Amino acid sequence: VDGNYSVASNVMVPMRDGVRLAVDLYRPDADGPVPVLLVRNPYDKFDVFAWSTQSTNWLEFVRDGYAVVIQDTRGLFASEGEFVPHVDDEADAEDTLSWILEQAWCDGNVGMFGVSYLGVTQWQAAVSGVGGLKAIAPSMASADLYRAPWYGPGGALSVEALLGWSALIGRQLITSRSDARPEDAADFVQLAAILNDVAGAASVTPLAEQPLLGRLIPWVIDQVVDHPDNDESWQSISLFERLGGLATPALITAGWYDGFVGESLRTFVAVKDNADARLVVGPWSHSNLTGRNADRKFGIAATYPIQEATTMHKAFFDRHLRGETDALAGVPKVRLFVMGIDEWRDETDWPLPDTAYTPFYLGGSGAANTSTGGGTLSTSISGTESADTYLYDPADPVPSLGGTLLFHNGDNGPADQRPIHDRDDVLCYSTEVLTDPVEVTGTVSARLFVSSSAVDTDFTAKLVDVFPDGRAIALCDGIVRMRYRETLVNPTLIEAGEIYEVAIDMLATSNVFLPGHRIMVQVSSSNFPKYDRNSNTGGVIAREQLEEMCTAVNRIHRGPEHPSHIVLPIIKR
Amino acid sequence: VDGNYSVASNVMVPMRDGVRLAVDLYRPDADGPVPVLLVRNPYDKFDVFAWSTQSTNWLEFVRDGYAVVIQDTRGLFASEGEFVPHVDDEADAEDTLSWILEQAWCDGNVGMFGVSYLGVTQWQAAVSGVGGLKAIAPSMASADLYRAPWYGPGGALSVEALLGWSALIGRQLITSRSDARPEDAADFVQLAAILNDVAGAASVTPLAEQPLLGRLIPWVIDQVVDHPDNDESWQSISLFERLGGLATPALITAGWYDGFVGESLRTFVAVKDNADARLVVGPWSHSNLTGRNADRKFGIAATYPIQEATTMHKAFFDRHLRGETDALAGVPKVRLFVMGIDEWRDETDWPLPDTAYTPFYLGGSGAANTSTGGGTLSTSISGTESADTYLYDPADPVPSLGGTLLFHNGDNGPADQRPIHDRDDVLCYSTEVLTDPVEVTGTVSARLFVSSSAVDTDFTAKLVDVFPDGRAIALCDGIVRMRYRETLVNPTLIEAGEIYEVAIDMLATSNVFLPGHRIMVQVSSSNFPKYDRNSNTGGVIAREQLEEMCTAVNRIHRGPEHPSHIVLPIIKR
C-alpha cells in the first residue's frame, strides 16, 4: 500500500575482505523493485534523529516509494571490523552498492544523501564508478580531507576541529564498547572535559602528545598531526582530482559559516560541466542551522528549511533515479541566502556570472593597529609607501570568534569582533561609511605584501561587516602559513626582513553591505584555536614546546610599490 | 523478528461524533498483541524529526516491542474536522484510546509520551479514567492552561507566547490547506513578520485587534485575549483539580527556563502520593535544549540527554505497561540539573526534603534604583523604614531578557541582565559577595509591601546570580497584576497610596551561588513582552489604546514595619 513500509534492523552485509557491516532497510510495500537511497553513518544507524534534522525529512522518500538503507560504518556500533577514519570508506561503499544492486527490491537505481561525514562518504562512493549509482547529495562535505576539515588551503592545522571530533568519536567508541572496561568511566569524563574546553585542550604543547586521544584513536597523531604537508598520505584519501572524470549528478548543500564551505563550493565547480549539479548555501555553521546567533539574527526564513530541502531532494532523485525528465522544472541551479538583505536568491551559476573581482587596497595615515587606528580600504591604489608592524606572540594568539569554527564555540558564525579590536596585533582597515549598497557574493581572497623577523610565521585575513550600532560581524576569513605560501606539498622557509607577496584564500561569502555599514578587513598572524598557532621557528610546529617557540615582529606593507589588497567578488544587480 | 517493524500511514480512526482522525502505526513484527504508546500531535504526524529531538529516540521502543501510534489532532493535516486548541482533546484522546484498546495488536496496556502540546494532551487523556491507559510521560507541559502557557499565577497575559504560537499554527494551517487560497502567500509572509519581531507585534494597541491572527485562528481573541480572569472558560479546560483523584504513573520532564516549569512541577507534586511519579529537570528553555546560551554555558552534560531519556522512559513503561516490577531499580525519583556547580543530582522528593524556606530582606542606604544604587539583601530584618520609588511608563516597559520566554528570544534563558541595569525603574538588591556556597533549589516567591499612584499596576521580581566577571544571570522570575493579588477569579482594584502586601510567585530554580558571586533581586513593574504591560488604569488592558494608558509612580516599602523579602529554598548539604 502506497505510503506504507517496513524496517529490517541489522541486516549484515559482507565486504570483499569478509568483514560484515550492519544496515537497516526501510522498504516500501511494493510489487516490484524500487529506487534505493544509501546513507553511510559513523554515528549509529539506529540514532536517526541526531543527523536527520540537518538533512531531510527522508521518511517521506520511503512513503513515496524509495527504499532507504542506513549503514553503520566499519568497526562502529553493530558493524564488525576496526574503525579508522576515511581509509576504508571507498571500498566499503563500493561493496555496499553492489550488494544493494543485487537485491530483489532494488530496481538498479541507487542514490545517496546525508550531511558532514554522511556527505564525505558520498564522494568516496561516487569515485568507484559503480554504474548503478545515479546521483549523490553531499551536504556540508568535502572531496579533499586535507583542505577540509583537517588542515586547509593555507596549510595550518584545524586543531579545534581535530580535538573536538576525536573527543566525539572517542566518546562513541566507549558508550558502544564490545566488552566494557575499567578505564571507560574516567576516559569518558576526560573527553567531556576536552569538549567543554577545546581551546584549553589545544593549548597543551607539544600538540603531538595526546595520551588519551592518541590511545583511543591513534589516527589523530599517526595521520593528522604527523602529516602537516599535503603529502601522499593525504592525496591517497583525496577524491578531488578524480571529480573532473565523473558524470554523476550532485545536490550540494553548504553553509557560509560551515567548516566545509570552501570545499563544498569547489566540488560544485568541479562537477557542474559534466553533470547536473545543484547548489544550496544558507547562513549556517556546522552545529547551528537555526539562523539565530548571539549578536546576529537572519530571520526565520534563514532557518534550515528541512521540508523544502526534502521536496528538492525528491525532485532531484525523481529526475535521476526515476528518469522523470521534468521533475526539476522551476528549480534553480544555485540557491543562496544573501546576508545583509537576509534573503534567499536564485542564481544561474556559481561563481555568479558577472562577478567583478575588485581590489580594495589597504591605506590610511599612521598605524592601522586596533579598530581606532587609521587603517583604510579603498578601490584606489594608496598614495604613499607605509607599513604597519606588530608583535605576534604564540603564547598570546588572537582568539577565534565565529567564522567557520566547528567544535570550539561553533554555534556563533557571524560573531561580533569587538572583544579583539583593542589588541595591537589586530590591524584594521575599513571603508568610509557606505551610502550605496555593495553586494559581495563569491570566493574571497587577499594579496598581502609581508615581512617577518622570523623564518616562518602566519598571516590571517578576515572580512567584516561593520554595523551602524557598532557590531563588527565576521563574514569569512583565511590564513597562510608562510612555509606553504607557494605550495602545500613542498614547503620552504623565508628570509627574515625580506618582503613577500602572499595569497590568502578566505573561502567565500554572500553579503550585501548596506548603506550605513562599512567594509572592514582584520589582518593578523593568528586565529586560535580555529588554526593552531605558528611557532615562528621553522620547526615541526606540533612537536614544539611553548617555551621553545619565538615571538615575531611582523609587518604589512602598503602603498604604490606594495599594493596589498583584498579581492572582493562585487555583484551589481 | 525482534528489532523489526512495519509502518502504516493514515489509518483513519473515528471519533464519537463521526469525524475521522489520521494516525500512523509503528508496529513490531510479533506473534501476539503488544503494549502501545500514543502521541497526539498538532504539528504533522509525518514530520517526526521536528519534535522527537526534544523527547526520546522512540524508534527504540518499537525495536523493543512496543507499538507506537502517532496521531494528527482534529482538523490538522490528514485529520478531518475543525481545529480549535485544547477543547476537543479530552474526548478525542478518550476515543483514540478505546480504538487502540480494541485492536488485534494491542495487549490492553497503553502509555503516552511527548513534549509541549504532546505533553498537555497526555493530562487530557489521563483524566478520562480509561483503564487501559497505564502511564504517561508529559514533557515540558501543564495541567492548567491558564497558569501555563497563556497567563500565569500572577494574572498577566503571556503575550509573546500567545502571538508566537498563533503565528506558528497560522503558518501550518496555510502550508497544509484543503484548497489553496489567493491570500495565503501574503498571510504567510505577515505571520513570518510576527515571528521575526514578536515584541513589535505585541506592541500594537489595542492588543485585542488582531486582523490577521483573529481571522486565521479566532480562538486567539475569543478565548485567550477576551478572558483575562481565571473564569469558567479556563477551568473548563483545566485538568488540575482532577489530578488528585488519579492513580496514573507519570514521567515528568521540565526545564528551569521553560515556560511550563511552574506547572510541570505542580503536576509532579499533585500526583506523587497516588502513583509512581518521576521528575527530570534540566537547564533548558522551550526551544533551546543545548545547554549553550549567549552568556552562559552549562557544559555538554547539560545537553538534553536524549539516549538516557529513552532508557529512562523504556524502564518506566516496562514497569507500568509490562509489569516488570524491578525495571526502575537504581532509577532516582527526582533528577535535577543543579546550576552553579552545573551538575546532575539525584533527590528523593520535590520539594527537596530539608528545604529551609528562608527570608532575605530588602534594605540598603539611599535609593535602590539601578544596579549602582544601594539596595541590599540580608537574612536580618532591615533597621530603618525606607521606600524606593520609580515611575512605570507603559510606553517604555522593562524589556524581557531570558527567563521563561517562549517565542521572543526564547533561546537564551540565563540572560545577562546588564543591558537593563542603568534604568531607573529597575530596583536592585544584592547580598555581599559570598564566601560560602548557597544552594537555592525549590519553588521561589517574594512578599513585597507596595503602593501605587494608580488603581491597578504590576509588580515583578527576578532572582539573579551575579558573577565575579560582571555577568548578572537571570534564574527565575514572576509578576503580580495587582487586581489579581488575592484571587485570579474575582479581581478588585486598589486604593492609590495604600500599602499592600503582595505575593509574587517566581516559579522555581536550582542554583548554587558560588563564593565570589552575589544573590540579587530585581524589582520592577513590567517585563515585556514576556508579560503584557499593565495600563495602570483598572481598565480591560487588552482593549486599551497606548495613548489612553497612564504612567504610575510605584513604591517598594522596606524596614521593620514593612519587611519586604524574597523567600529562598535554601539547601545545605
Ligand SMILES: *C1(O)O[C@H](CS)[C@@H](CS)O1
Ligand atoms: C561531520 O559528521 O562532522 C565532522 C566535523 S569535523 C566531520 C568530520 S569528516 O563530519
Ligand SMILES: *C1(O)O[C@H](CS)[C@@H](CS)O1
Ligand atoms: C508546545 O508544542 O509549544 C507551545 C508553546 S506556547 C505549547 C502550546 S500548549 O505546546
Ligand SMILES: [Cl-]
Ligand atoms: Cl526479506
Ligand SMILES: [Cl-]
Ligand atoms: Cl576491519
Ligand SMILES: [Cl-]
Ligand atoms: Cl540582527
Ligand SMILES: [Cl-]
Ligand atoms: Cl527569503
Ligand SMILES: [Cl-]
Ligand atoms: Cl550575476
Ligand SMILES: [Cl-]
Ligand atoms: Cl570615515
Ligand SMILES: [Cl-]
Ligand atoms: Cl626597521
Ligand SMILES: [Cl-]
Ligand atoms: Cl622590495
Ligand SMILES: [Cl-]
Ligand atoms: Cl493490518
Ligand SMILES: [Cl-]
Ligand atoms: Cl471538527
Ligand SMILES: [Cl-]
Ligand atoms: Cl559559562
Ligand SMILES: [Cl-]
Ligand atoms: Cl553531571
Ligand SMILES: [Cl-]
Ligand atoms: Cl535535601
Ligand SMILES: [Cl-]
Ligand atoms: Cl558589598
